[PDB]
């Protein structure tokens, strides 16, 4: 019997490519804070790990920092997934799943994560599912074309990267809990 | 309430420097397999992670492989610490604790683990003790002088490394610098 079993309300995961308008989408839920546990992607944690900016170090030098960075992402995800709450609904931006199935996978594919590094991350994921409870009742997929995503980012990463991520999200969420697809172009 | 709470028997951890004679010591317990859950240090796992030898890659190029290797060590330790068993006594060679307090710490000190890497490992350890139950009722410390340890290895790593490790084991198990979890029982391997 897993950690945090039966301690979690109905949980909705917001999934989508970089620049699919997740942050904008989640701001619409702001006014229900008293009723909804609302956890945005923990970027602030990744950018300040006792002063160290793992996210930056990763984009700067992936062959070296992808492994610890992704490892840290996994941790922060679990921190959100298990964080206790009294509310009757929980909404999370991204998840341990997008981290594993899209980001880690893509990093392996383009050789940022070497085999041994990928294998370590994966061994953890396998242990994590046997030991920690990840509540997930509904995914909302903010589906977009990579080009529209690319555009949105410019008004505020290569298109090729966004394409790769998009394909991986599609493999996971379309081509295969219940997924619910929204058009955000 | 943590994972694997109340699923574990009395647990003894065998701790000591590289070459303190842990493997030899644990072989004496072999003949009680039916009565004792007896888990040796999972080196085999570290040497074959879907074909990859993490242990080797670590000694070959520490700045790059220490982080994943130690991360993997942590995992295998947890795998042992929580592995279910019907026996009334469990004996583990090394532990999540030696990994954290001695090996990871030393790797930070000599710059194998860079700050961000160390910090990630530590954040995990902190999350791990809030979420996973690590049963530990008694530590047996195979205490030795680094020189004797060094000698034992030759009959079968720099002396400076063994010295550093020894000092860290001593800080943890004798001088009680780190958080204690249970009673330490010291043996002289001489
Ligand atoms: C969840 C997740 C996000 N990200 C990134 C992509 C974006 O650059 C940034 C903000 O989400 O974080 C990863 O790199 N890996 C991950 O596993
Ligand atoms: C437990 C542990 C062992 N080891 C090493 C030291 C020894 O050379 C080898 C077999 O014990 O594995 C680590 O490097 N880190 C660890 O955390």
PDB file of N, CA and C in Angstrom, chain A residues 16-18 102 141-147 149 159-172 175:
ATOM      1  N   UNK A  16       0.251  19.849 -21.918  1.00  0.00           N
ATOM      2  CA  UNK A  16       0.401  20.541 -23.181  1.00  0.00           C
ATOM      3  C   UNK A  16       1.847  20.912 -23.445  1.00  0.00           C
ATOM      4  N   UNK A  17       2.133  21.268 -24.698  1.00  0.00           N
ATOM      5  CA  UNK A  17       3.463  21.683 -25.127  1.00  0.00           C
ATOM      6  C   UNK A  17       3.881  22.981 -24.445  1.00  0.00           C
ATOM      7  N   UNK A  18       5.171  23.303 -24.510  1.00  0.00           N
ATOM      8  CA  UNK A  18       5.631  24.609 -24.075  1.00  0.00           C
ATOM      9  C   UNK A  18       4.893  25.601 -24.959  1.00  0.00           C
ATOM     10  N   UNK A 102       7.401  12.578 -21.956  1.00  0.00           N
ATOM     11  CA  UNK A 102       7.723  13.556 -22.983  1.00  0.00           C
ATOM     12  C   UNK A 102       9.119  14.122 -22.799  1.00  0.00           C
ATOM     13  N   UNK A 141      -5.857  18.188 -22.077  1.00  0.00           N
ATOM     14  CA  UNK A 141      -4.771  18.348 -23.031  1.00  0.00           C
ATOM     15  C   UNK A 141      -4.991  19.622 -23.836  1.00  0.00           C
ATOM     16  N   UNK A 142      -4.149  20.622 -23.610  1.00  0.00           N
ATOM     17  CA  UNK A 142      -4.171  21.837 -24.415  1.00  0.00           C
ATOM     18  C   UNK A 142      -3.415  21.562 -25.695  1.00  0.00           C
ATOM     19  N   UNK A 143      -4.108  20.930 -26.634  1.00  0.00           N
ATOM     20  CA  UNK A 143      -3.539  20.551 -27.925  1.00  0.00           C
ATOM     21  C   UNK A 143      -3.347  21.742 -28.858  1.00  0.00           C
ATOM     22  N   UNK A 144      -2.182  21.814 -29.499  1.00  0.00           N
ATOM     23  CA  UNK A 144      -1.856  22.888 -30.439  1.00  0.00           C
ATOM     24  C   UNK A 144      -0.914  22.382 -31.506  1.00  0.00           C
ATOM     25  N   UNK A 145      -0.824  23.121 -32.606  1.00  0.00           N
ATOM     26  CA  UNK A 145       0.218  22.867 -33.583  1.00  0.00           C
ATOM     27  C   UNK A 145       1.513  23.518 -33.084  1.00  0.00           C
ATOM     28  N   UNK A 146       2.649  22.851 -33.291  1.00  0.00           N
ATOM     29  CA  UNK A 146       3.951  23.369 -32.853  1.00  0.00           C
ATOM     30  C   UNK A 146       4.209  24.809 -33.287  1.00  0.00           C
ATOM     31  N   UNK A 147       3.703  25.192 -34.459  1.00  0.00           N
ATOM     32  CA  UNK A 147       3.937  26.522 -35.027  1.00  0.00           C
ATOM     33  C   UNK A 147       3.249  27.605 -34.201  1.00  0.00           C
ATOM     34  N   UNK A 149       2.391  27.264 -31.123  1.00  0.00           N
ATOM     35  CA  UNK A 149       3.088  27.251 -29.846  1.00  0.00           C
ATOM     36  C   UNK A 149       4.310  28.136 -29.956  1.00  0.00           C
ATOM     37  N   UNK A 159      11.963  25.520 -33.033  1.00  0.00           N
ATOM     38  CA  UNK A 159      10.695  24.928 -33.451  1.00  0.00           C
ATOM     39  C   UNK A 159      10.798  23.400 -33.525  1.00  0.00           C
ATOM     40  N   UNK A 160      11.981  22.910 -33.882  1.00  0.00           N
ATOM     41  CA  UNK A 160      12.242  21.478 -33.951  1.00  0.00           C
ATOM     42  C   UNK A 160      11.993  20.788 -32.605  1.00  0.00           C
ATOM     43  N   UNK A 161      12.444  21.417 -31.520  1.00  0.00           N
ATOM     44  CA  UNK A 161      12.230  20.923 -30.160  1.00  0.00           C
ATOM     45  C   UNK A 161      10.738  20.859 -29.856  1.00  0.00           C
ATOM     46  N   UNK A 162      10.026  21.931 -30.179  1.00  0.00           N
ATOM     47  CA  UNK A 162       8.595  22.002 -29.945  1.00  0.00           C
ATOM     48  C   UNK A 162       7.836  20.966 -30.747  1.00  0.00           C
ATOM     49  N   UNK A 163       8.351  20.652 -31.933  1.00  0.00           N
ATOM     50  CA  UNK A 163       7.785  19.620 -32.799  1.00  0.00           C
ATOM     51  C   UNK A 163       7.908  18.245 -32.140  1.00  0.00           C
ATOM     52  N   UNK A 164       9.121  17.941 -31.679  1.00  0.00           N
ATOM     53  CA  UNK A 164       9.434  16.701 -30.985  1.00  0.00           C
ATOM     54  C   UNK A 164       8.552  16.514 -29.758  1.00  0.00           C
ATOM     55  N   UNK A 165       8.471  17.551 -28.929  1.00  0.00           N
ATOM     56  CA  UNK A 165       7.619  17.539 -27.745  1.00  0.00           C
ATOM     57  C   UNK A 165       6.164  17.305 -28.102  1.00  0.00           C
ATOM     58  N   UNK A 166       5.694  18.015 -29.123  1.00  0.00           N
ATOM     59  CA  UNK A 166       4.326  17.874 -29.597  1.00  0.00           C
ATOM     60  C   UNK A 166       4.034  16.420 -29.977  1.00  0.00           C
ATOM     61  N   UNK A 167       4.903  15.833 -30.802  1.00  0.00           N
ATOM     62  CA  UNK A 167       4.735  14.448 -31.234  1.00  0.00           C
ATOM     63  C   UNK A 167       4.640  13.487 -30.048  1.00  0.00           C
ATOM     64  N   UNK A 168       5.456  13.729 -29.024  1.00  0.00           N
ATOM     65  CA  UNK A 168       5.481  12.894 -27.833  1.00  0.00           C
ATOM     66  C   UNK A 168       4.225  13.040 -26.999  1.00  0.00           C
ATOM     67  N   UNK A 169       3.727  14.267 -26.895  1.00  0.00           N
ATOM     68  CA  UNK A 169       2.462  14.529 -26.220  1.00  0.00           C
ATOM     69  C   UNK A 169       1.329  13.824 -26.957  1.00  0.00           C
ATOM     70  N   UNK A 170       1.403  13.842 -28.287  1.00  0.00           N
ATOM     71  CA  UNK A 170       0.391  13.213 -29.125  1.00  0.00           C
ATOM     72  C   UNK A 170       0.404  11.692 -28.973  1.00  0.00           C
ATOM     73  N   UNK A 171       1.599  11.098 -28.999  1.00  0.00           N
ATOM     74  CA  UNK A 171       1.773   9.667 -28.735  1.00  0.00           C
ATOM     75  C   UNK A 171       1.122   9.264 -27.425  1.00  0.00           C
ATOM     76  N   UNK A 172       1.335  10.072 -26.389  1.00  0.00           N
ATOM     77  CA  UNK A 172       0.873   9.766 -25.049  1.00  0.00           C
ATOM     78  C   UNK A 172      -0.634   9.969 -24.928  1.00  0.00           C
ATOM     79  N   UNK A 175      -2.815   9.039 -29.543  1.00  0.00           N
ATOM     80  CA  UNK A 175      -2.568   7.718 -30.127  1.00  0.00           C
ATOM     81  C   UNK A 175      -2.415   6.623 -29.062  1.00  0.00           C
TER      82      UNK A 175
END
